[PDB]
Amino acid sequence: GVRTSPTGEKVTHTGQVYDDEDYRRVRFVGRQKEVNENFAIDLIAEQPVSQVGSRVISCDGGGGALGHPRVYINLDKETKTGTCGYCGLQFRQQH
Amino acid sequence: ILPGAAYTEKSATYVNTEGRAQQTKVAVMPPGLAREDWKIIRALSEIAGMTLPYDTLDQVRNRLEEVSPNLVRYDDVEGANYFQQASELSKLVNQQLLADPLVPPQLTIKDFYMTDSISRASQTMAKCVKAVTE
């Protein structure tokens, strides 16, 4: 979801772009501002809310010892999904 | 506008309500071109042809000790005596009390957060005031 600032320059996923009068655009004159166009928030908004049949769900990022340490998430609020702290996955109790 | 330093941006003697003199220490330097306050006033006296007899902060605190000698002795409350003479001086000016009741300017938690020139420019204090309204 990369967008272009009104100075003609691409915006990072942090929110970094140089303004109109800032001289430090001159380091990109004739070269390119290398940014990543696969934003983390955009690629995790696509992931579905996992319906699980337990009150307390265990997340480890997948892979066992290849992901984040395994944390336990409470799922009592039906208003709010239970978002994992590390991986951005989120769960919901199905009843 | 002559932009000065904040309170975390200058070594600075402040005194509480009980007379205990304290000094701040420089956490970060002031942003942009803003200077320490008495540096601004000393340079303004150098421009205006009325050059003050100090350069650095030690000479400022020698001057400040000349004015009142508690402001450079930190973490030491100097107890003030002589209440009865101020009481005798107070009896001369017979002033009328008003019929208006004593109302403090800070009644509830909403009036607590935004008072001075730092707390009005804070978004955290804005969230606190907005959060204690409802």
Partner: protein, 126 residues
């Protein structure tokens, strides 16, 4: 004899090679390092520290790093007594100031006073 009698001030400000720019224009601070309130331990309030006044830290225009020009910026020295720290500051000609030790006072902790008969210091919960 083989021993000389020197009654002068102990002055090695010309032998340490430190320039004048950072001998007379620095305010050394001798202080018991105050306890971090996140934790309860007092092992970092046992030995005195000499720090220096923080100088200018600016944005490196290429990378946003905190560039500096203070050579004595990252110097904190550990002393055991206040007399040795004051003698070290006066031996190097460093203009100093000393903040005294702020010990925690002895409290009067009683356990039955949480469950008193006629006092305001009862607990409403536990």
């Amino acid at each position: 004899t083989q021993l000389i009698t020197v009654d002068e001030k102990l002055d090695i400000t010309t032998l340490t090679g430190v320039p004048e720019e950072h001998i007379k224009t620095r305010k050394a601070r001798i202080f018991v390092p105050a306890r971090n309130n996140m934790q309860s331990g007092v092992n970092n309030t046992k030995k005195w520290k000499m720090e220096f006044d923080t100088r200018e830290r600016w944005e490196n225009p290429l990378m946003g790093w905190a560039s500096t020009a203070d050579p004595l910026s990252n110097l904190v020295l550990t002393f055991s007594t206040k007399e040795d720290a004051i003698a070290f500051a006066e031996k190097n000609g460093w203009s100093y100031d000393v903040e005294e030790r702020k010990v925690p006072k002895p409290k009067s902790k009683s356990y039955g006073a949480n469950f008193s008969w006629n006092k305001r210091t009862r607990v409403s919960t536990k």
